[PDB]
């Protein structure tokens, strides 16, 4: 029950190396001028989307260094971005109370298609995620998380078992379930076809700024402003590993043994999951490192910062 801990279970095999993990820089260049608010990987590893406080949403190429498509915005003050798994639909929201689904087509920067706009929230929209080619989950500053549709253009269900601003969301790559955070700290998991909450966890009286599902899909991690990271399991309602300037962003590798993390003033850091120890801090970025996300295939890693730069790592399995 609570006596089971991941470090104590992982005592049989400790780390093999704790220094000099191979990471190769690929790109230190951008055409952006403002801080990267969000960047997200496509479901296939080919392309990454990103945005800034400037009007453009850019599609970057993972293998090469140059830009495939740069989509302008109706709202300049964007906080989040998304790409559909079909990779024909792109989404944006934040500080406008409206979620905007553009369509990228014909390899151009015109932004010819504003397919749908949704006006249901009276507060800022922090996290956007795509479920499939048709649905679109977003979470607001008000308690609602709405799943709009591209044909129907209306809400299906509103999960509002939280009080306080919802900062992030998590979808496992594989059932079809989501998770969210909040200021009055909670990390409920939802089956996302019923309005009630499936689970709940410890509050710790802090705001939670970053959520990631494990690569197998059975675990969940939650980073906070006090520098704490939770490692809860999807089942059984038990806290497993606390990892204790705050955590702005998280991701796992394809292996799931090392967790890339972003701290407010430390910078980008890599954590050994089994040992629970710091291995391979990344001081490469000149400015405040906003976020880190790894690829679905796992060959590359992407990092973005306030200095309007993207850094693509590409290790040999790290």
């Amino acid at each position: 029950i609570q006596d089971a801990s991941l470090f104590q279970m992982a005592n049989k095999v400790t780390s093999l190396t704790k220094n000099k993990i191979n990471l190769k820089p690929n790109i230190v260049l951008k055409g952006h001028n403002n801080k990267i608010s969000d960047f997200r990987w496509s479901r296939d590893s080919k392309r990454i989307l990103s945005a800034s406080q400037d009007g453009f949403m850019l599609i970057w190429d993972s293998a090469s260094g140059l830009k495939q498509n740069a989509i302008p915005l109706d709202s300049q003050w964007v906080l989040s971005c998304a790409i559909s798994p079909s990779s024909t639909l792109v989404a944006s929201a934040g500080l406008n109370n409206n979620c905007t689904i553009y369509r990228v087509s014909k390899e151009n920067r015109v932004a010819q298609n504003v397919a749908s706009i949704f006006k249901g929230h009276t507060c800022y929209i922090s996290d956007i995620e795509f479920t499939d080619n048709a649905h679109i989950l977003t979470a607001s500053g008000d308690m609602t998380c709405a799943l709009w549709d591209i044909p129907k253009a209306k809400r299906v269900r509103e999960y509002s078992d939280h009080l306080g601003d919802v900062l992030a969301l998590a979808i496992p790559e594989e059932s079809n379930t989501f998770a969210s955070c909040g200021s009055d700290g909670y990390t409920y998991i939802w089956d996302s076809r019923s309005p009630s909450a499936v689970q709940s966890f410890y509050v710790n009286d802090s705001d939670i700024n970053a959520l990631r599902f494990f690569k197998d899909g059975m675990s969940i991690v939650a980073g906070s402003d006090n520098g704490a990271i939770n490692m809860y399991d999807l089942r059984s309602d038990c806290s497993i590993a606390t990892f204790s300037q705050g955590v702005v962003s998280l991701d796992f590798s394809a292996s799931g043994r090392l967790m890339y993390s972003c701290y407010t003033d430390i910078g980008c850091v890599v954590w050994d999951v089994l040992k629970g120890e710091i291995v391979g801090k990344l001081e490469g970025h000149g400015g405040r490192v906003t976020g880190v996300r790894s690829s679905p295939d796992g060959l590359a890693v992407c990092t973005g910062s306030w200095d309007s730069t993207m850094k693509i790592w590409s290790p040999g399995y790290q």
Binding site: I1, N22, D216, S219, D233, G256, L274
Partner: peptide
């Protein structure tokens, strides 16, 4: 399952299998 040890086991197993250290 209610026991957390199986959860820790599936985490360490899914990260252990299909690994390499080619560096």
């Amino acid at each position: 399952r209610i026991t957390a040890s199986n959860a820790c086991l599936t985490i360490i197993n899914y990260t252990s299998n299909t690994k390499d250290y080619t560096l």
